[PDB]
Amino acid sequence: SARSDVNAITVLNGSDFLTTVKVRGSNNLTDSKSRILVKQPISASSFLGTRISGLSQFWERYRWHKAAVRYVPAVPNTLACQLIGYIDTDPLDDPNVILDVDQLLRQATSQVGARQWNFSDTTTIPLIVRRDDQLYYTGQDKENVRFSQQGVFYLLQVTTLLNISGEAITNDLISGSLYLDWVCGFSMPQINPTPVEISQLTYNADTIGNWVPPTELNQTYTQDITGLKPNSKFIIVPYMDRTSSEVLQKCTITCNEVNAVGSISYFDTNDIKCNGYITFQANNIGEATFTLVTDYKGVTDAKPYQYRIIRAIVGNN
Amino acid sequence: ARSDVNAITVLNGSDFLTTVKVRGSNNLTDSKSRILVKQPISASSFLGTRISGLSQFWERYRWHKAAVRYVPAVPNTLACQLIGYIDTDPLDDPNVILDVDQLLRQATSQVGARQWNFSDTTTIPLIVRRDDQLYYTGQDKENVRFSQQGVFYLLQVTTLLNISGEAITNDLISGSLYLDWVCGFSMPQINPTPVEISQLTYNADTIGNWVPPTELNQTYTQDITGLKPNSKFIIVPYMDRTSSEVLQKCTITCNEVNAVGSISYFDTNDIKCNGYITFQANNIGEATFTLVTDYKGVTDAKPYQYRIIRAIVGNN
Amino acid sequence: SGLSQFWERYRWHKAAVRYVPAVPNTLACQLIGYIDTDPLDDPNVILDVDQLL
Amino acid sequence: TTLLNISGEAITNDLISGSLYLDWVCGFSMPQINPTPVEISQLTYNADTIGNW
Amino acid sequence: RQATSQVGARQWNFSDTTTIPLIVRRDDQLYYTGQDKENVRFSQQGVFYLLQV
Amino acid sequence: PQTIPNFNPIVAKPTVAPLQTNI
Amino acid sequence: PQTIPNFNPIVAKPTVAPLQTNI
Ligand SMILES: [Ca+2]
Ligand SMILES: [Ca+2]
Ligand SMILES: [Ca+2]
Ligand SMILES: [Ca+2]
Ligand SMILES: [Ca+2]
C-alpha cells in the first residue's frame, strides 16, 4: 500500500554533458598551473541541468557503481597536442602545490585509472571504486569534502598546440567536450535546499562591514574579507553614513583575480562622490582580497568607510 | 556504461499540494463557489514537490497506488461536511452544473470518493485504469487527456455551524492536502522549461534620477519605466554631486508582495545615504514610489541618483 | 510514405538513422543528434545554448 | 635534422612533440631506509649599494 | 528520395569510384537504334541521371 | 622470487586516422 | 507474418583513403 516508510536503493542510468574544454596556447601557458586546465569534481550535485545534478536534489546519498568520462573531439587530425586525465579518489590530495612540470605528470600516470590520448581522438576515462560499502552525501561541499565527493577529474595538458605550418597558436581553442555516462544508486528520499529553484530569489542584504583606515597619509594597502561561502558570485556597493572636513579621498579597486567589472571611490569634499560596483567570485577557502588607494591628508580618521555585499539565492551559486 | 535500454523505475514518496479554506455564508451563492479547489493530479503540476522536479526527467508516467490525505487545522467545535473525488476524464467540468443537488451527486458516485467532516482526516484514493496507457509529461500544451490521470475536486456540503448551531460568515482556513504516490516512469530525457540565461550575471550599469520639487513639502508618486514585465529588483542609493543645504528624504515603496526596505538621504556636515528596497514589477514596466520631502532647500539643487541591478538568471 | 496511405495505423518495430559523411578529417564540428518521442515539447523555445545541449 | 612543415620550409619556433615512457623490470637486494637530504642556506645580508634622492 | 528508390542506385563521394549498373526488364523486348524520332520508349533503354547533393 | 605482481603496468593500443572513409 | 521480403533494402560498405601508398 501507500505511505511505505521504507528506504530502498534505486539504480539509475543515463548520459550527461560536462563543460567544453579550452586548450591554452602560448600567451596563457607559462607555469605548472597552466598545464592544468579543468579541476572539476565528479560528484552528483555538481552541475546545472544535467539529469544527474537535478536528479540528486531529491535523494540524499549516492555511490557510483560504474562511471566513465568520455572525450569527443571537435578538431581535425592535422593539429598536434596531447593530454591526460585521471580521477583521484582523495579530493583533498591537491596538485595545486607541485612546481616542476614533470613531477606533475608522473603523479598522473600512477593513479590506477589514468589514460593518455591526442586531442583529435576519443577514449573513456573510468572511475575506480573503493573496496567498501561507503555512501557519499549529495549537495554542496560544506565543511569537509571526503563525505560528498567520490572523485575529482583532473585533465591536464602536456604539449603546446600548433597549426599545420608548425606555428604555435597564440590564443585559446575549443578541443571538444566531455559527457559522462553513468550508473549510480541513491538511497534516502528527501530534498536538499542548496540548489533552490527559480521564482524564489530574495536578494539578501544584511551584512555591513567596514574598511580598515590607513595610518599614514598616502598609501595603497590591502584588505581581505572572511566569513563568505567557499564559492559564489557576489557584488559590492558603497555605503556611507559619516562626516568630513577637508577631503578624505579614497579609491578601492577590484580584487586581484579574473573577475572585474569596474571600480569604486570615496570623496567627501563639497564635490562629494560615492559610487561604484565590483563583481567577483570568492576563492575556494571562502574569502577575498582587495587593494586600496588612499590619498587623503587627515590622519585622525576615526571613521572607517562602510560597504555592503548582496547576492541572489537562485542555485548553488 | 552505455546501455541504450528503457526501463520503468518504480519510485515512491510523499508531497504537499496546497492549503484549503472553506466558504462562509456570505461567499456561498451557487455551484461555482460550492467547489473551492480544482487542482489537477499529474506529476508535473506542482511548484517543486519532488515530482514536479522529478517528473521533468522522464516523458511518461503511470500512477500505481496514489492517495490524497486531508489533515485538519480546526477544533471539533466547527463542522461543515465536505466530500472529495478524483475524476479521470479531466475534461469533465462540474462548473457546468448549476443545481447543487446533482452537483453533489455526480461526485460520490465516482469510485474513489470519500465523505467526511472537516474536523477529522480521510484518505482519498486514485483508481487506475485497466489498459497499459502511459501519460506524457510536461505542461498541458494543448490537450489534457494525454497528460492527466486525474484531477481533484473538494466540495462544500451545507454551511458551517458553531457551538450553539449558527452559520458564521467569515472565510476560514481549515486544513491542508497531502499526497502519497507510487508511480512508474519511462524513457529518460529532459523536458524543456524556458530559460534564457543559465548562469549568474549582474546588470550593474542602469542609472536614473529622482526629481525633487520646487515645493517645501509634498509627497509624490514618482514612477520608473524601461524595465521587464515582471521581475525582481533592488535599489541602492548613491550620489556623485555637491550641496551645502539641509536636505532630507526618507522615501518608501508602494507594493504589496515585496516592500521590505527603506531609503534615506541627508547631506550636510553629517551624511546618510543608506538603505535598500526590493520589489516586484507589475506587468507594465512600471513601479510606484513615494517621497517624503522634508528639506528646506526649496530651490532645486540637483536631483539624486538611483540604480537598479537586474540579475541575469533563468528569468530575472 | 505513399504506401502508408493504404493503412490507418503503424508502429516502428525498429529504426535507425545513419550519417553518411561528405568531408575529409580536416574539418571539425561536434554535432549531436537524437530522437525525442514527445513531438510537442520542442527545443525552439529555449533561448540559451548551454541548456540546449 | 632541422624542422620542416607541410610545404618544405623550416619552422622558426621551438615546440613540444611527444612523450617518453619507461617499461622496466628491476631487482632490489638489501632492506633498509636511506635518509632524506635536508639542506638550508644561512642568511646573507647585502649592503653594497649607495642610494640617491 | 526518388533516386534512392530505383533499383540500381548508388551514392559516392566525387573522390572515389563505383559502378552504376543497368537493370534489365523481364521481357524479350528489342529497342531500335537511331535518333529519337516520335516516341522514346522504342529507342532508349534507360536514362542516366547524375545529380549533386 | 619474492615478486609482487602487477605493480604499475601500462598497456598501449595503436590505431589509425585516415583522410577519408568514403563509405 | 504477411511480410513481403526485400522491399527497399540498402547495403553500405566502407573503405579508406590513405595519404600515400609508398609501394
Ligand atoms: Ca591521490
Ligand atoms: Ca467523470
Ligand atoms: Ca468524462
Ligand atoms: Ca523529449
Ligand atoms: Ca515531453
Calculate the alpha carbon distances from D18 to A83, D7, D13, G18 in Å.
Answer: 10, 22, 16, 23
Copy the grid coordinates of residue B90. 479531466
Phi, psi of A158 (to 5 degrees): -95, -65
For residue A183, the Cα-to-chain-centroid distance in whole angstroms is 25
- CA–CA distance, A245 with E23 (Å, rounded to integer): 103
Cβ–Cβ contact F21 with E under 8 A: no
* Terminal-to-terminal C-alpha distance of chain D: 56
Query: B207 with B229: CB under 8 angstroms?
Result: no
Is E in contact with F (3 or more beta carbon pairs below 8 Å)? yes
The residue in chain C having the minimum alpha-carbon distance to the alpha carbon of residue F17 is: C25
Phi, psi of A105 (to 5 degrees): -90, -25
Q: Which ligand is nearest to the CA of A51?
A: 4
Residues in chain D: 53
Cα–Cα nearest to A290, from A230, A232, A212: A212
Strands in B15-22's sheet, in edge-to-edge order, are B15-22, B172-179, B67-72, B122-125
Angle at A34 (CA atoms; ends A31, A36), nearest 5 degrees: 125
Give the torsion through C-alpha atoms of A220, A221, A227, A232, to 10 deg.
40
Query: 3-class SS at C3?
Result: helix
Query: B152 with B40: CB under 8 angstroms?
Result: yes
DSSP letter (8 states) at residue E50:
-
Cα–Cα nearest to B162, from B78, B75, B76, B74: B78
- CA–CA distance, G16 with D7 (Å, rounded to integer): 24
Contact A109 F15 (CB under 8 A): no
Q: Which residues are within 8 A (CB) of A6 and not within 5 positions of it... i.e. 6 or more apart?
A: B12
Copy the grid coordinates of residue C20. 553518411
* Terminal-to-terminal C-alpha distance of chain E: 11
Cα–Cα nearest to A302, from A228, A175, A210: A210
Tell me how the structure was determined. Answer: cryo-EM
Chains A–F, number of C-beta pairs less than 8 Å apart: 6
Copy the grid coordinates of residue D12. 622558426
Q: What is the 3-state secondary structure (H, E, C) of chain A?
A: CCCCCCCCCEEEEECCCCCCCCECCCCCCCCHHHHEEEEEECCCCCCCCCCCCCCCCCECEECEEEEEEEEECCCCCCCCCEEEEEEECCCCCCHHHCCCHHHHHHCCCCCCCCEEEECCCCCEEECCCCCCCCCEECCCCCCCCCCCCCCEEEEEECCCCCCCCCCCCCCCECCCEECCEEEEEECCECCCCCCCCCCCCCCEEEECCECCCCCCCEECCEEEECCCCCCCCEEEEEECCCECCCCCCECCECCCCCCCCCEEEEECCCCCEEEECEEECCCCCCCEEEECCEECCCCCCCCCCEEEEEECCCCCC
Cβ–Cβ contact F17 with C under 8 A: yes
- CA–CA distance, A223 with A211 (Å, rounded to integer): 8
Interface of C with F in 1-53 (CB under 8 A): 20-21, 24-26
Copy the grid coordinates of residue A174. 575549443
Cβ–Cβ contact F6 with A under 8 A: no
CB-based burial of residue B176 (10 Å sphere; 0-12 exposed, 13-18 middle, 19+ buried)? middle
Q: How many CA atoms lie within 13 A of B131 on its CB side?
A: 4
Chains with 3 or more CB pairs under 8 A to chain E: C, F, G
- CA–CA distance, E35 with E38 (Å, rounded to integer): 9
- CA–CA distance, B106 with B125 (Å, rounded to integer): 17
- CA–CA distance, B37 with B155 (Å, rounded to integer): 8
Cα–Cα nearest to B1, from A135, A181, F8, E52: A181
CB-based burial of residue C9 (10 Å sphere; 0-12 exposed, 13-18 middle, 19+ buried)? exposed
Query: A273 with A265: CB under 8 angstroms?
Result: yes
B9 known member of a binding site: no
Query: B167 with B27: CB under 8 angstroms?
Result: no
Cβ–Cβ contact C28 with A under 8 A: yes
- CA–CA distance, B258 with C41 (Å, rounded to integer): 34
Phi, psi of B250 (to 5 degrees): -135, 50
Query: 3-class SS at C5?
Result: helix
Query: 3-class SS at G5?
Result: coil
**CB nearest to B192's CB, from C37, C46, C50:** C46
Query: B126 with B150: CB under 8 angstroms?
Result: yes
DSSP result, B169-188: -S-EEEEEEEE--EEE-EEE
Cα–Cα nearest to B35, from B140, B155, B149, B148: B155
Copy the grid coordinates of residue B154. 473538494
**CB nearest to C28's CB, from A17, A49, A74:** A74
A271 known member of a binding site: no
- CA–CA distance, A26 with A169 (Å, rounded to integer): 7
The type of residue at B290 is T
Q: Which residues are within 8 A (CB) of A279 and not within 5 positions of it... i.e. 6 or more apart?
A: A233, A234, A235, A259, A260, A261, B202, B204
Q: Which residues are within 8 A (CB) of A299 and not within 5 positions of it... i.e. 6 or more apart?
A: A215, A216, A217
Query: B20 with B30: CB under 8 angstroms?
Result: no
DSSP result, chain B: ---------EEE--EEEEEEEE--STT--SHHHH--EEEEE-TT-SSSSSSTTTTTSEEEE-BSS-EEEEEE-S-TT---EEEEE--S-TT--GGG---HHHHTTSSSSSSSEEEEETTS-EEEE-PPPSS---EE-SS--S-STTS-SEEEEE---S----TTS----S-EEEEEEEE--EEE-EEE-------S--S--EETT--EEE---SSSS-----B--S--SS-EEEEEEEB-----S-EEE--EE--SS---EEE-EEESSBEE--EEEEEE-BTTTB-BEE-----S--S----EEEEE-EE-STT-
- CA–CA distance, A36 with A154 (Å, rounded to integer): 7
Calculate the alpha carbon distances from B198 to A38, B163, B307, C49 in Å.
Answer: 20, 56, 24, 9
Cα B187 to ligand 4 centre (Å): 9
Query: 3-class SS at C6?
Result: helix
Calculate the alpha carbon distances from G11 to A163, C14, E11, E48, G6 in Å.
Answer: 38, 17, 11, 21, 12
- Resolution value (Å, 1 decimal): 3.3
Beta bridge mates, B123: B69
Q: How many CA atoms lie within 13 A of A264 on its CB side?
A: 26
Strands in B271-272's sheet, in edge-to-edge order, are B247-249, B265-267, B271-272
A7 known member of a binding site: no
- Rounded to the nearest angstrom, the minimum Cα separation between E1 and chain C is 11
Which residue in this structure is represented by grid cell 569527443?
A72
The type of residue at C10 is Y
Residues of F in contact with G18 (CB under 8 A): 18-19
Contact F23 C21 (CB under 8 A): yes
**CB nearest to B273's CB, from A57, A181, A274:** A274
Calculate the alpha carbon distances from B93 to A66, B42, B104, B151, B275 in Å.
Answer: 50, 17, 13, 10, 51
